[PDB]
Amino acid sequence: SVVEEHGQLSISNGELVNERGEQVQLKGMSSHGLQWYGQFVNYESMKWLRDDWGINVFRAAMYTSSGGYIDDPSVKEKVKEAVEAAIDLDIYVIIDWHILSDNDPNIYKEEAKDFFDEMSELYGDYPNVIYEIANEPNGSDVTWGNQIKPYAEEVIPIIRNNDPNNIIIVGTGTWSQDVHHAADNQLADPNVMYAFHFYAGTHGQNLRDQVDYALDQGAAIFVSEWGTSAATGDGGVFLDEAQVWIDFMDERNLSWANWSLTHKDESSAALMPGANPTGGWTEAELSPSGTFVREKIRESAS
Ligand SMILES: [Ca+2]
Ligand SMILES: [Ca+2]
Ligand SMILES: [Ca+2]
Ligand SMILES: [Ca+2]
Ligand SMILES: [Ca+2]
Ligand SMILES: [Ca+2]
Numbered sequence: 001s002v003v004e005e006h007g008q009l010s011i012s013n014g015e016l017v018n019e020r021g022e023q024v025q026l027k028g029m030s031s032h033g034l035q036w037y038g039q040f041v042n043y044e045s046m047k048w049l050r051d052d053w054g055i056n057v058f059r060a061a062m063y064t065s066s067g068g069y070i071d072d073p074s075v076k077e078k079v080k081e082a083v084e085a086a087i088d089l090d091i092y093v094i095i096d097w098h099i100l101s102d103n104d105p106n107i108y109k110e111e112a113k114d115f116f117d118e119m120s121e122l123y124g125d126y127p128n129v130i131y132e133i134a135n136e137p138n139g140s141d142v143t144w145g146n147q148i149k150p151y152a153e154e155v156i157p158i159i160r161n162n163d164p165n166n167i168i169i170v171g172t173g174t175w176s177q178d179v180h181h182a183a184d185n186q187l188a189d190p191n192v193m194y195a196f197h198f199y200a201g202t203h204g205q206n207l208r209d210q211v212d213y214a215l216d217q218g219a220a221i222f223v224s225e226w227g228t229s230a231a232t233g234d235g236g237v238f239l240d241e242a243q244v245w246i247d248f249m250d251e252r253n254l255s256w257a258n259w260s261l262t263h264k265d266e267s268s269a270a271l272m273p274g275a276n277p278t279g280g281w282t283e284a285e286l287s288p289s290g291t292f293v294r295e296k297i298r299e300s301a302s
Contacts, residue, residue: 002056003090008127009167011191014220016167016255019127026092026255027297028057029270030225031082032262033098035067038078039277040261043085048279049261050089053294054301058086059094059224059257061135065102070111079119086128094169094224094257095119096132104142105134105151105171112151113158124163131159132224134171136197143173144181156189169222171195177207179221183214193222196254199268200242201230208248215252223249223256228289229267237267237289246296258293270294 006018018024029049031041041060049055060082064070079095086093097112099105105112116131123129133155137148152170159168168191172178176197183194196211214221226245228237249256263271270290275281286294 001090002050003092003128008165009092009130010165011167011193011220014215014218015253016193016220016222023253024255025250025253025300026057026257027300028055028059028091028257029053029261029293030059030094030096030257030259031061032260032264032269033061033063033066033068034075034078035063035072037262037264038075040263040271041078041082042278043081043088044278045261046082046085046091047089048281050091052279054297055091056301057092057094057130057255057257058082059096059132061096061098061260063098063100064108064111065100068098069115070108076115080122083119083123083129087123087126090128092128092130094130094132096135096224098135099171100136100138103137103139104147105137106147109151109154113155116155116159117162120159120162124159124166127166129163130167130169132169132171132195135195135225136175137171137173138175144178144185148173148182149185149187152187152192156187156192160189165191167191167193169193169195169224176225177203177210179214179219180210183217183219186217186219193220195224196221197223197225198245199227199229199231200245201228201235201238202232204241208245221254223254225259226256227259227268228292233266233268237292239288239292242292250300
């Protein structure tokens with residue numbers, strides 16, 4: 001019913017809107033690296049997330065490096081499974097070319113173009129699909145002007161050749177935090193959004209103000225990844241500051257996906273070690289982070 005209701009999404013003056021031009025706010029979960037935790041991404045778990053949590057978007061995090069797609073492209077099968085599950089469950093789905101240690105998106109440009117050509121040819125006619133062409137550019141020598149914008153200017157046309165209208169999310173500098181630099185030199189494609197990522201235990205008002213600067217320049221922002229923990233991964237979760245960020249996003253109608261749906265023993269993980277991979281979780285199988293996120297999504301779901 002999510003996609004049946006909103007249909008084709010588009011950007012209108014920086015806002016994500018549905019086919020009737022009404023505002024749409026997506027809230028969902030990101031998987032962790034599919035090469036490590038792909039078992040948690042399947043029809044049943046996505047259905048449980050849809051039905052029990054109220055998600056309306058699922059983010060498939062396909063690492064390029066770290067035993068990801070570059071070395072083992074078979075992980076692409078897991079991406080297809082997720083996309084097909086999303087189409088069957090009628091929710092939106094983000095295909096994330098998840099760069100991280102390969103901090104300049106131009107490292108695997110040729111491969112990214114080939115991957116997005118294939119995905120857009122296969123799924124471009126479905127409104128459910130959203131492309132995230134470079135998770136988190138990072139490093140002092142990777143900037144919007146020299147590396148990221150030119151990379152997007154090459155990948156977007158590849159996608160547009162097959163899919164003229166689905167949303168494309170583009171990463172920004174400093175682990176997708178530098179949305180102000182991007183907002184000052186925006187892409188021409190109308191259905192683009194810039195990624196903003198944060199950690200509730202580390203990022204506060206300064207970054208919120210940075211996000212507002214970007215919004216004030218007419219840029220559309222998708223919080224395609226955010227954690228409840230500290231970047232250090234120490235001290236547990238920080239739900240007080242997470243709630244400040246949730247409110248901030250609601251005021252501005254910002255869409256978001258939480259990191260992450262895994263049983264890994266790290267504060268940002270939504271699940272406890274051993275949690276059932278196909279869903280149907282008991283409250284005992286959810287971590288404090290997972291319990292909080294589930295409530296945020298449920299409490300705003302219809
Ligand atoms: Ca099956
Ligand atoms: Ca082609
Ligand atoms: Ca399309
Ligand atoms: Ca080029
Ligand atoms: Ca991150
Ligand atoms: Ca709203």
